[PDB]
């Protein structure tokens, strides 16, 4: 199966650094789920996923979403990863809530009960007052994360860059451990 989804938001924060982050963590991981970048067969096989990357709320008075990625056949995803533009706070709460709602509708529709797994990485320091403003969810970034962690044991790990901001400490308010233990100078492990 291996139904994993990848979400990033550090585009506005770090553009050039995002390229190295990709080529060091995502591009090798992409070969774990694909026989090689060509095309390739893509259909409703359960292993399909999404691709959500957006920006912050400050420079966005009329646009927040341009996503289109039903399956991507595990090729178009890495194809548009490189081909994306770029651009304080991060407003990652909105993207996190949208991804949460998407995972919810997947579990409610793509059932077979399905051992959903996911990974999320964001280099930008997130902080914002609004949470969803689109659905029942309402709160803050802290509320959003404790909801995503405590209410449901969604398997989530955070392999942050070697630089560490003043957010890791506050991000330990979730009863499920963030599991930042995989900190090793060796290269990216396939599946620890």
């Amino acid at each position: 199966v291996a139904d994993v989804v990848f979400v990033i938001e550090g585009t506005a924060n770090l553009g050039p650094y995002f390229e190295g982050l990709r080529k060091h963590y995502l591009l090798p991981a992409i070969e774990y789920f694909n026989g090689g970048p060509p095309d390739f067969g893509g259909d409703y096989g359960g292993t399909q996923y999404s691709l959500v990357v957006f920006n912050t709320v400050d420079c966005a008075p009329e646009s927040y979403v341009q996503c289109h990625a039903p399956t991507s056949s595990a090729y178009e995803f890495v194809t548009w990863l490189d081909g994306i533009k770029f651009m304080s706070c991060s407003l990652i709460a909105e993207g996190l809530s949208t991804a949460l709602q998407l995972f919810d509708d997947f579990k409610k529709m793509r059932e077979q009960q399905t051992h959903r797994v996911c990974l999320l990485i964001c280099n930008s320091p997130p902080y914002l007052l609004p949470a969803v403003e689109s659905t029942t969810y309402s709160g803050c970034t802290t509320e959003n994360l404790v909801q995503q962690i405590g209410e449901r044991g969604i398997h989530f790990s955070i392999v942050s860059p070697r630089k560490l901001p003043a957010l890791r400490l506050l991000f330990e308010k979730a009863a499920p451990p963030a599991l930042l233990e995989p900190l090793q100078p060796p290269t990216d492990v396939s599946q620890d």
Partner: protein
């Protein structure tokens, strides 16, 4: 195929589940095609050692492993490592557990062979070459070659491969007797396969001729199969092949076509003369294009048959061989006849007391010297004495042609001595009675033998009666041909028990072919002379059709032959169910007889119903309007069937023009446009046009007027939105009618309109 496969999976599997299990026992290849292409893409990816071998079959894992049944025999064996267990999906012969030594009759194509083509290509080739290496060590057990004979598309797509295989097998004439290749296939190839590429079949003709010539063939006593196959194939190709394909036989006739097959050469030139009529290949010029036929004329005059000597040589544009009139030497100047009679008399008187000498005397055979004595023997109550039988079967293997030629000439000369009827009673009482049991000729070569002298003008008035008693001679064996009606016609394409059928048939009725019906002192049965006998004597029809042609189209002067031929067809109807080519069979019968057909048409008024009556002996459910025409033409044929001919014309041209999308290509054509002469519906247009109304004075003018009334006059049924197609169909028809029909049309058009 990657993007093609992606788009196909996108288009076809447009849903959100895994539906359509699609068992489909009758036919499931179309349904399981998705699973098959999935398996093939996975195999290709594994062979490429990349793309992760297309993993995650989670989507359609159900259909992916549906294999774990005849219907489920989706052979993906072609790749590799599936030739032992998945090959067993088709039941093979039984060799471990214990003539008629082969169980498991053959399989039918439509059932499973309709799809499995890419796998079984040269499996049997290994078997036949392994057999050919050392020798035919045992009587051939595999009878599954029947299925192999029903394989046209294989050679149609791999002509290079089969050609290379044939070339590699060619040295088997020096390897072992050249026997294990010919009799294995030739009979089914000639029987099960009727239509074939012209160049291919003429190359096969040349190859079989070369093999017959070299190496030694005198030991193949049953070689008559080769001659029958050659004559049957050479007749089915002379329609429109010579003029286009001349470039394909520029040198093949120049090398070898006249080694020993004189009868075959005569039949070939007769078929050529028949073809020449269609379509005016030699009428235009006189001898400019005659270079194509001058070499053939030279080759045949190297043995000079066909020596009418300019008497009734009228079925030609210009008789060029007519110059050589002195080569006839008929009956050796009428004087050496009595001399050879006295010579064979003296030879009989010597044979009375030269038994130990006649063996060394009959060296070289001497065909027109000794064989005439055969009339004296068997007149003494089977005076065979078996002294020369072995020597004959040992030496005359080639000279038997001239032997039976002289024998036929002598017998027709002896029977011609009636001349008035004073002998007819003696004939009926003793002569035709003793000749019954047991003639060795078995009506093999009598055709050209009779054609050489009986058709001559000299004594046609008695040669006519000779032919008449000849066709009426069968009265003891014709019963077998009569009862043989419900043996082949019931089972000819829908094989269910044909194997055991013909086994039982050729077991019960016949006892032997090479020996005589006498049981001597010791009789060791040891039945082994039965290599391959699928058809015992049904094959004779393919040779008899040219005989019936030459006996009517060439012998037509005397009318009472009409009373004979109708009984002939009433008796041979069931035998006629093997092929239907009336166009070349009737078109040539009107090359120059239109000005005088009235005499022939006075009996053709019945012969039309005789021919269509014989044609009624066929149940393919392929005709539903000709019978309606017959019904509308059964009472007072001199009043009714003229006017509604226009209706029939509109109906047939509508069937023709509607070949594309309508409903006419429904119950009319069927099953399966493979052996029923359907490369095109073209001939199905001309099928009835001629035979329509040859009975009355309808031909000549009224036919053309009727055909043109649908043009200058607005027919009610004729719709004014598709005129062009109708005119095209009328042209298609008229291009295939005899001369006067489409000749008078021009004059009528230019007559008054201009």
């Amino acid at each position: 195929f990657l993007p093609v496969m992606k788009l196909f999976d996108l288009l076809y599997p447009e849903k959100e589940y895994i539906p359509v299990p699609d068992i489909n026992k009758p036919q499931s290849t179309h349904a399981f095609a998705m699973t098959c292409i999935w398996i093939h893409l996975n195999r290709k990816a594994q062979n490429d050692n990349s793309k992760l071998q297309i993993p995650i079959p989670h989507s359609l894992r159900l259909h992916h492993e549906f294999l774990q049944i005849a219907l489920l025999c989706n052979a993906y064996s072609t790749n590799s490592e599936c030739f032992t267990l998945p090959m067993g999906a088709l039941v093979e012969t039984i060799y471990g557990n214990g003539g008629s030594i082969t169980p498991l009759p053959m399989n039918l194509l439509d059932s499973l062979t309709v799809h499995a083509k890419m796998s079984l290509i040269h499996s049997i080739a290994t078997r036949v070459i392994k057999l050919a290496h050392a020798k035919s060590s045992v009587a051939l057990a595999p009878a599954l070659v029947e299925t192999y004979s029903r394989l046209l598309v294989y050679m149609e797509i791999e002509s290079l491969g089969i050609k290379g295989f044939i070339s590699q097998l060619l040295p088997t004439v020096f390897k072992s007797h050249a026997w294990g290749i010919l009799h294995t296939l030739l009979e089914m190839f000639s029987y099960r396969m009727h239509h074939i590429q012209p160049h291919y079949r003429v190359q096969l003709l040349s190859h079989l001729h070369t093999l017959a010539a070299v190496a030694q063939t005198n030991q193949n006593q049953l070689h008559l199969c080769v001659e029958s196959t050659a004559l049957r194939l050479i007749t089915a190709l002379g329609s429109s092949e010579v003029q286009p394909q001349f470039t394909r036989f520029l040198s093949d006739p120049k090398t070898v076509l006249s080694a020993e097959s004189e009868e075959l050469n005569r039949a070939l030139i007769l078929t050529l003369a028949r073809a020449t009529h269609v379509t005016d290949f030699f009428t235009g010029s006189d001898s400019i294009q005659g270079t194509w036929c001058k070499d053939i004329l030279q080759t045949i005059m190297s043995f000079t048959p066909h020596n009418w000597a300019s008497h009734t040589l009228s079925c030609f544009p210009g008789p060029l061989q007519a110059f050589f009139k002195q080569n006839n030497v008929p009956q050796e100047s009428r004087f050496n006849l009595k001399k050879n009679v006295e010579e064979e008399y003296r030879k009989w008187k010597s044979m009375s007391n030269e038994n130990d000498i006649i063996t060394h005397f009959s060296m070289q055979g001497s065909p027109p010297l000794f064989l005439c004595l055969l009339w004296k023997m068997l007149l003494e109550t089977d005076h065979i004495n078996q002294i020369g039988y072995r020597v004959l079967e040992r030496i005359g293997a080639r000279a038997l042609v001239a032997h039976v030629r002289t024998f036929a000439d002598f017998l027709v000369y002896e029977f011609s001595t009636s001349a008035g009827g004073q002998q007819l009673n003696k004939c009926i009482e003793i002569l035709n009675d003793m000749v019954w049991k047991y003639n060795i000729v078995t009506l093999d070569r009598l055709i050209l033998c009779l054609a050489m002298r009986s058709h001559e003008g000299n004594e046609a008035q008695v040669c006519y009666f000779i032919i008449q008693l000849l066709l009426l001679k069968p009265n003891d064996f014709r019963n077998r041909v009569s009862d043989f009606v419900k043996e082949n016609s019931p089972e000819h394409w829908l094989q269910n028990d044909w194997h055991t059928k013909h086994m039982n048939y050729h077991k019960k009725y016949p006892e032997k072919l090479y020996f005589e019906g006498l049981a001597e002192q010791v009789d060791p049965p040891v039945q082994i002379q039965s290599p391959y006998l699928p058809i015992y004597f049904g094959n004779v029809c393919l040779r008899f059709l040219p005989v019936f042609d030459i006996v009517i189209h060439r012998f037509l002067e005397l009318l009472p032959v009409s009373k004979s031929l109708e009984t002939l067809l009433d008796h041979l109807g069931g035998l006629y169910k093997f092929h239907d080519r009336p166009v070349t069979y009737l078109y040539n019968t009107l090359h120059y007889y239109e000005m005088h057909l009235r005499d022939r048409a006075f009996l053709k008024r019945k012969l039309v119903h005789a021919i269509i009556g014989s044609l009624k002996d066929n149940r393919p459910q392929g005709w539903c309007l000709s019978d309606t025409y017959l019904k509308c033409a059964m009472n007072a044929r001199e009043e009714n069937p003229w006017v509604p001919d226009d209706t029939y014309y509109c109906r047939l041209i509508g069937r023709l023009v509607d070949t594309m999308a309508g409903k006419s290509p429904g119950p009319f054509p069927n099953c399966d446009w493979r052996f029923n002469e359907f490369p095109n519906p073209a001939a199905h247009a001309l099928h009835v046009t001629c035979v329509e109304l040859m009975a009355l004075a309808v031909s000549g003018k009224e036919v053309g007027n009727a055909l043109l009334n649908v043009v200058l006059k607005s027919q009610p049924l004729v719709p004014r939105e598709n005129i062009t197609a109708w005119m095209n169909a009328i042209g298609l028809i008229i291009t295939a009618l005899p001369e006067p029909y489409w000749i008078v049309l021009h004059d009528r058009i230019v007559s008054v309109i201009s």
